[PDB]
Amino acid sequence: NQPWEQALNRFWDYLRWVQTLSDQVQEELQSSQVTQELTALMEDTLTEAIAYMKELEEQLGPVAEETRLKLTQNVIDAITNLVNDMAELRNRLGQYRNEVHTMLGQSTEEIRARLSTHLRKMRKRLMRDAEDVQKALAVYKAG
């Protein structure tokens, strides 16, 4: 219950730090450090989430096979939507690094705003998807 959501909160904190567009995050965006750090954070989040889901399934009662299969599939589909949005965020951060490499070192002051709006919409949809993942987990604790 708590551990995977605590990992998700650490991921949120890192996402806020990267969407502040500080000069530290602007020099780490070109060293690919933020990309792999975000990757490790969301990987820990996903591992905790799937561990919680596997424990919930492990303590599933006198369940019919098809219903258990469908519930597990619901949780897995929620998690994989989260993974899809996460991977899109990661790939677009890499693309932003390689397309500020298009002038080889310097970035403008408006491509930052465009990237920032993209990151804000990504954060909102990530919150929505993570909370429906938690909802699917709650639904799993039944039957």
Epitope: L46, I50, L69, T72, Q73, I76, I79, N84
Partner: antibody, heavy 121, light 110 residues
């Protein structure tokens, strides 16, 4: 219109290892189980193993467990099979196939084009 | 190779033919059987799952059945396009893994 696309053909010497990849184009296959099935020239299908990464399950066939390693990168929507200690007996065609659900019981309804692996001295 | 199929099966156009698939108490006795079709030089295609279900693209000329330790595929209205190899597959708990049959080479006379 999700499609599994595999890496190109491989020609190896006995004793080396091979790594075949399987990329999902037009969609994600993370919520499904991807299994690797090999077919020797003129022989039948042979299950090597499989992986569903979101469910966190990598299973191997008992024949290949000591040699094969199956993994997946979920952020690039790719699966990988690495076969070690290649001999002449391993020349075959390797397909990656996607099951109907997150586990390996269901039928494999989406198939890649296959990777030809030729091991010869 | 825990499942057994007849290696060769023939039939005239229009005829109805069957492919048998006998297993054990650990692969077909407790798990469902799938049927795949493979043409020369191409990837296999899922033809039957859960012993009797057809994918939407598979015509109703193909049917499946399962009885205890055995399974059976039935191809009615045999056409020349059906010359292929047919594999039955299941999950073996004794082996803890997927098992296939030897493959049946369906040839059409004429």
């Amino acid at each position: 219109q999700v499609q599994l696309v595999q890496s190109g053909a491989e020609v190896k010497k006995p004793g080396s290892s091979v790594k075949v990849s399987c990329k999902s184009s037009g969609g994600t296959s993370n919520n499904y189980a991807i299994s690797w099935v090999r077919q020797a020239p003129g022989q039948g299908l042979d299950w090597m193993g499989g992986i569903s990464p979101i469910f966190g399950s990598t299973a191997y066939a008992q024949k290949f467990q000591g040699r094969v390693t199956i993994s997946a990168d979920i952020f690039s929507n790719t699966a990988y099979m690495e076969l070690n200690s290649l001999t002449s007996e391993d020349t075959a065609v390797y397909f990656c196939a996607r099951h109907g659900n997150y586990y390996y019981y269901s039928g494999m309804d989406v198939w890649g084009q296959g990777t030809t692996v030729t091991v010869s001295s | 190779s825990a499942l057994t199929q007849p290696p060769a099966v023939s039939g005239t156009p229009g005829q109805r033919v069957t492919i048998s698939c006998s297993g054990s108490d650990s692969n077909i006795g407790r798990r469902s059987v799938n049927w795949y079709q493979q043409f020369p030089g191409t990837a296999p295609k899922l033809l039957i799952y859960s012993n009797d279900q057809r994918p939407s693209v598979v015509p109703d000329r193909f049917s499946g059945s399962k009885s205890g330790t055995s399974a059976s595929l039935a191809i009615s209205g045999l056409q020349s396009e059906d010359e292929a190899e047919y594999y039955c597959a299941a999950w073996d708990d004794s082996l803890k893994g997927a098992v296939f049959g030897g493959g049946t080479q369906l040839t059409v006379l004429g």
